[PDB]
Design an enzyme around this catalytic site. Structure first.
Site, mmCIF file in Angstrom:
data_model
loop_
_atom_site.group_PDB
_atom_site.id
_atom_site.type_symbol
_atom_site.label_atom_id
_atom_site.label_comp_id
_atom_site.label_asym_id
_atom_site.label_seq_id
_atom_site.Cartn_x
_atom_site.Cartn_y
_atom_site.Cartn_z
ATOM 1 N N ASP A 341 -0.154 -6.829 6.446
ATOM 2 C CA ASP A 341 -0.789 -5.553 6.238
ATOM 3 C C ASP A 341 -1.572 -5.164 7.477
ATOM 4 O O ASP A 341 -1.845 -5.968 8.400
ATOM 5 C CB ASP A 341 -1.689 -5.672 5.006
ATOM 6 C CG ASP A 341 -1.928 -4.386 4.244
ATOM 7 O OD1 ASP A 341 -1.623 -3.265 4.756
ATOM 8 O OD2 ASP A 341 -2.672 -4.484 3.188
ATOM 9 N N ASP A 401 -1.025 3.440 -0.854
ATOM 10 C CA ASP A 401 -1.124 2.586 -2.010
ATOM 11 C C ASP A 401 -0.985 3.359 -3.317
ATOM 12 O O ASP A 401 -1.535 4.469 -3.475
ATOM 13 C CB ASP A 401 -2.467 1.868 -2.046
ATOM 14 C CG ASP A 401 -2.599 0.766 -1.002
ATOM 15 O OD1 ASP A 401 -1.741 0.595 -0.121
ATOM 16 O OD2 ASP A 401 -3.680 0.062 -1.090
HETATM 17 C C1 7D8 Z 1 -3.082 -3.284 2.465
HETATM 18 C C2 7D8 Z 1 -2.020 -3.029 1.367
HETATM 19 F F1 7D8 Z 1 -1.453 -1.723 1.630
HETATM 20 C C3 7D8 Z 1 -2.453 -3.041 -0.089
HETATM 21 O O1 7D8 Z 1 -1.255 -3.104 -0.898
HETATM 22 C C4 7D8 Z 1 -3.372 -4.238 -0.367
HETATM 23 O O2 7D8 Z 1 -2.601 -5.378 0.037
HETATM 24 C C5 7D8 Z 1 -4.571 -4.217 0.464
HETATM 25 C C6 7D8 Z 1 -5.567 -5.362 0.184
HETATM 26 O O3 7D8 Z 1 -6.719 -5.214 1.080
HETATM 27 C C7 7D8 Z 1 -5.176 -2.857 0.836
HETATM 28 C C8 7D8 Z 1 -4.448 -3.686 1.873
#
Ligand code: 7D8
Length: 539
Positions: A341, A401
């Site tokens: 990520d 998200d």
């Molecule tokens: C990045 C990802 F987009 C999301 O799905 C999750 O894994 C988080 C956890 O911090 C926000 C970061």
């Protein structure tokens, strides 16, 4: 017997390529500080411009043409919008300084002009770059003209390096054009498209940072009754950003977690943010010279977890060796699914040890990860520059998200909301099975501790199935009962086809999506993300 082609049409007469009238040929542009050698060639459904450049090209103007009124524009990274916008009523957004580089890698542009990264489309034409290996390719609308640029970030080249190739495709079938653009991108970068897509469970969208190992183990047991291959621990387990092998709370060691999951019959997955190190991390405070700088000081890449997050300088061999060791270690423990990520951090502009572009730095980092985990591991990119990851990642998050609410009145600004997560799955559908496997983000199918309605869950999940996207569930499995289990089963039966969004230039969140040859035969789903209604037909 001369056979060179020139566009016949009146719109195409505006086209200027490196300052030249647009036609087939080989050409040279010599400026004070750089030299470009390029070729224009007719290809199936359009034209391809390719070549090489040396000197200091800086922000290199490639193409200028008249701007269409309604344009599909694309943000460079996972979370950012891919949407149809009016080219002439654009007003510069307010950019949150905590997340500036998610908006643009060249925010000086976006502060004045409409920007699109990598490609832009209008009904009947696609303009698109086939790679981003050295330069960042982008488009801007400047007083009624659409301008294509390759940003070299002040890096100088003594010898020729390849241009990122540009195609201009034309046909009334815009979805076809986007699909063919993406096929060309896949060939240019040797895209990884696995034949098998994993199903799985992810902790994030129920537990968030409140996950405990106790809760993880409850779900690991219940997951045995679900059609999950991968069991992936998300952000929660680690003591700090960068300190990936140090766990907190009730979690056992990172190695122990892998072995518990594997002994329970699942492929172990793990989340990291591998190009990020927080200001409080052991790794940063041990190795302060490992980060991208601004005036010799560490440059904030973004602010999250209520602290400043710095970017690893992927031009440094010490840094690449640390990533290699980390991911090799993870592979040795038995992890075979890696969600990586905030990858945009690796490509932030700034001062690096070597005078390479941020895109070159990024590519070295992600290639290092790939080598470390091996061929048989699945890499899922997230918060990532899209074109520079092609050929490296197996799967890619292509939207903001999701969340346990629809977001009927939530702004389209890259923040969490199931409505916008799904919009991007639709508008970037064409990347799927061409760049990588598209990840539309997790299905949230629980019946308690959620603001989603049953119709919303169906709409999201069935759309993702029709699109043949990755299917990962993220719930406290205790709270998934007959409706949620049924939605999952039915979603999995919609997979396997070749999808097309037939009205990709839509302006009102109502989409007609077909998929041929699914496990349920030919299917069609018509969805409206504002009314939260759908109509599904199955052969
Ligand atoms: C990045 C990802 F987009 C999301 O799905 C999750 O894994 C988080 C956890 O911090 C926000 C970061």
């Amino acid at each position: 017997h001369s056979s060179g082609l020139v566009p016949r049409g009146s719109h195409m007469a505006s086209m200027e390529i490196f300052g030249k009238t647009f036609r087939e040929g080989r050409f040279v542009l010599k400026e004070k500080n750089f030299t470009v050698e390029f070729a224009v060639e007719k290809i199936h459904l359009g034209w391809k411009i390719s070549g090489r450049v040396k000197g200091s090209p800086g922000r290199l103007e490639v193409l200028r043409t008249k701007a269409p009124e309604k344009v599909l524009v694309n943000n460079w990274q996972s979370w950012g919008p891919c949407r149809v916008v009016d080219a002439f009523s654009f007003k510069p957004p307010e950019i949150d300084p905590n997340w500036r580089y998610t908006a643009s890698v060249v925010p000086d542009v976006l502060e004045r002009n409409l920007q699109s990264d990598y490609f832009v489309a209008e009904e009947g034409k696609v303009y698109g770059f086939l790679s981003s290996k050295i330069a960042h390719p982008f488009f801007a609308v400047e007083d009624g003209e659409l301008v294509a640029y390759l940003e070299y970030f002040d890096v100088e080249f003594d010898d020729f390096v390849p241009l990122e190739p540009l195609v201009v495709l034309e046909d009334p079938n815009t979805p076809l054009l986007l699909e063919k653009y993406a096929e060309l991108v896949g060939m240019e970068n040797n895209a990884r498209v696995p034949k098998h897509t994993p199903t799985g469970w992810c902790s994030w969208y129920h537990y968030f940072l409140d996950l405990t190992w106790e809760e993880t183990l409850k779900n690991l047991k219940l997951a045995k009754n679900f059609p999950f291959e991968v069991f992936q621990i998300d952000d929660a387990y680690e003591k700090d950003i960068g300190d990936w092998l140090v766990t907190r709370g009730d979690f056992p060691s990172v190695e122990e977690m892998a072995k518990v999951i594997a002994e329970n019959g699942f492929i172990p997955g793990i989340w990291t943010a591998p190009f990020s190190v927080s200001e409080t991390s052991d790794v940063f405070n041990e190795h302060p010279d490992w980060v991208v700088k601004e005036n010799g000081e560490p440059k904030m890449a973004y602010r999250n977890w209520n602290k400043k997050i710095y970017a690893l300088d992927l031009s440094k061999d010490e840094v690449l060796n640390w990533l290699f060791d980390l991911f090799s270690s993870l592979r040795k423990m038995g992890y075979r699914y890696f969600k990586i990520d905030f990858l945009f951090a690796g490509a932030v502009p700034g001062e690096r040890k070597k005078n390479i572009t941020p895109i070159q730095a990024f590519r070295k980092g992600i290639e290092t990860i790939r080598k470390a985990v091996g061929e048989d591991s699945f890499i899922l990119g997230c918060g990532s520059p899209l074109l520079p990851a092609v050929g490296c990642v197996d799967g890619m998050r292509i939207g903001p998200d999701t969340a346990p609410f629809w977001g009927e009145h939530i702004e389209d600004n890259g923040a969490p909301a199931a409505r916008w997560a799904l919009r991007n799955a639709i508008t970037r559908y064409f990347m799927h099975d061409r760049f990588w496997l598209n990840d539309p983000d997790c299905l949230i199918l629980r019946e308690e501790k959620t603001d989603l309605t049953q119709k919303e869950k169906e709409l999201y999940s069935y759309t993702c199935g029709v699109l043949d996207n990755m299917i990962i569930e993220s719930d406290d499995l205790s709270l998934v009962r007959d409706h949620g289990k049924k939605v999952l089963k039915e979603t999995l039966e919609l997979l396997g086809g070749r999808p097309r969004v037939q009205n990709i230039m839509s302006e009102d969140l109502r989409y007609e999506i077909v998929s041929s040859g699914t496990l349920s035969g030919n299917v069609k789903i018509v969805v409206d993300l504002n009314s939260r209604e759908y109509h599904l037909e199955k052969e």
